[PDB]
Paper text:
Here, we present the crystal structure of the truncated (ΔVR1, residues 1–39) N-terminal cytoplasmic domain from human NDCBE-D (ntcNDCBE) at 2.8 Å resolution. Each monomeric ntcNDCBE forms an α-β sandwich fold by nine α-helices and ten β-strands. The main dimer interface is generated through a domain-swapped antiparallel β-sheet, including β-strands 5 and 10. The domain-swapped β-sheet is stabilized by backbone hydrogen-bonding interactions between residues Thr341 and Leu343 from β10 in each monomer, as well as backbone hydrogen bonds by Leu108 (β5) with Val342 (β10) and Leu110 (β5) with Val340 (loop between α9 and β10) on the adjacent sides. However, to establish whether ntcNDCBE forms a dimer in solution at lower concentrations, the construct was subjected to size-exclusion chromatography (SEC), and eluted at volumes corresponding to the hydrodynamic volume of a dimer. By superimposing the central β-sheet (β1-3, β6-9) of the individual monomers of cdb3 (chain P) and ntcNDCBE (chain A), a pivotal movement of ~23° is observed between each monomer, while the central dimerization domain-swapped β-sheet (β5, β10) remains intact. We identify and describe a novel Zn2+-binding site and the completely conserved HHH motif also found in the electroneutral sodium-bicarbonate transporters (NBCn1 and NCBE) surrounded by a shell of negatively charged residues on the surface of ntcNDCBE. In the WT protein, Trp80 is engaged in a π-π stacking with His167, which is likely rearranged upon Zn2+ binding. The experiments were severely hampered by the crystal conditions, as we were only able to form crystals at pH 4.4.
The sodium-driven chloride/bicarbonate exchanger (NDCBE) is a member of the sodium-bicarbonate cotransporters (NBCs) within the solute carrier 4 (SLC4) gene family. In the brain, NDCBE is primarily associated with the presynaptic vesicles of glutamatergic and GABAergic neurons. In the plasma membrane, most SLC4 transporters are believed to form functional dimers. Furthermore, NDCBE activity depends on a Na+ gradient.
Residue numbers in the entry:
A (entry chain B): 43 to 72, 78 to 171, 241 to 344
B (entry chain A): 42 to 173, 232 to 344
């Protein structure tokens, strides 16, 4: 699994070049999207009712939530080098998966697309940076969670989506039923935090298929130290 | 769940199976052909960890242990595939080793020559840090009813597979010359394998010792009735650790 790993990091690729990442975590509960955290090697969280950004700190993760993230990449939608130039397009491509629309009602799809297209309220530094939008939260009508990892082919400035006008390269979407909100917050944190890992973040840029990503996670998990 | 099994354990009626606080010592060996070799204490725990450093000259300042995730999975793997002998009634280190080596499974993997070397290794003296009654100011720091846990890892030239054993004694026993401090031994962990696995084993040893400082896991260790209770223990622990990227 470091076998699978090394083959990826050293593939010939043009435009698939890695950039530095700004990562924003927004959350929803069905109501609008609310920015709750952001990354840039260090993490800051929204607090005191939205009044304030915390001081920057070095993120730590619950192993539990990393496993959940891993499970998400095994069972979820993974769309790489998606050529979409807007959020409508992205959401429809996800929802129109011949498998992912076979888990949802007609009624369930309506609510979810409506959610992905809700406005993003924000709290309101590298040159060639791209953005990664981690969008997680609850939707009342769901009975299953909905997971998607997307990598756009040209990065695209998705209007009003990121707190800073930066082109999006990655999106992670985790939507699920009520009572899963805190779990999703940490899964979201884990996706964001793991993208700050230098080696894993390269894998995400160069991955050609779902298993490549799992090799990335597994290699990460194999190298970290834990605090009892 | 894996806290299903867990919650069931934490609350079973058991007498003398009562949990105690733990002193844990990590000793390491290396058996290279022709070269004589004994056990050397390399670390100890009492909630905090201290390591032997600078070539055996010195103890470290006490610190809060951290573990490699890798070595914890290996440890889990050790408990899945290794010898698990709970409530062993043995009153000496000879007796304990024979019981381990006489598992109808664990002796169907070994040469006659391989059993000989390994028994010889287990019976080597244990060098402790105290230049060597003659003990410490450390002994004062030890809770009154505490029992000890001995983590023994290392290399044996003649092995080609690793050898793992987790043992819990039924009465705890003051195994002569084994612990650096006269405390009855309750737990033993043994990991012996071929040369070149030495540093890997050191971290599995640290993981074993450290996981015994865990309040919940150490309760499971005292009350486990079977190998599966231990793994639920390990899995619960893993589910709750925090990771430092």
């Amino acid at each position: 699994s470091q076998r699978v790993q090394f083959i990826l990091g050293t593939e010939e690729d043009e435009e698939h070049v890695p950039h530095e990442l700004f990562t924003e975590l927004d959350e929803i509960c069905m109501a609008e999207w609310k920015e709750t955290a952001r990354w840039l090697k260090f993490e800051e969280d929204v607090e005191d009712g939205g009044e304030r950004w915390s001081k920057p700190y070095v993120a730590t993760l619950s192993l539990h939530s990393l496993f959940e993230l891993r499970s998400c990449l095994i069972n979820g939608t993974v769309l790489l080098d998606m050529h979409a130039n807007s959020i409508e397009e992205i959401s429809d491509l996800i929802l129109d998966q011949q498998e992912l629309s076979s888990d949802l009602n007609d009624s369930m799809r309506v609510k979810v697309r409506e959610a992905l297209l809700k406005k993003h309220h924000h709290q309101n530094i590298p040159t060639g940076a791209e953005a990664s939008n981690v969008l997680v939260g609850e939707v009342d009508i769901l009975d299953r969670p909905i997971v998607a990892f997307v990598r756009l082919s040209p990065a695209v400035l998705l209007s009003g989506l990121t707190e800073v006008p930066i082109p999006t390269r990655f999106l992670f979407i985790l939507l699920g039923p009520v009572g899963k909100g805190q779990q999703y917050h940490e899964i979201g944190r884990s996706m964001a935090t793991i993208m700050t890992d230098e080696i894993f973040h390269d894998v995400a840029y160069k991955a050609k298929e779902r298993d490549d990503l799992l090799a990335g996670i597994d290699e990460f998990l194999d190298q970290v130290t834990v605090l009892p």
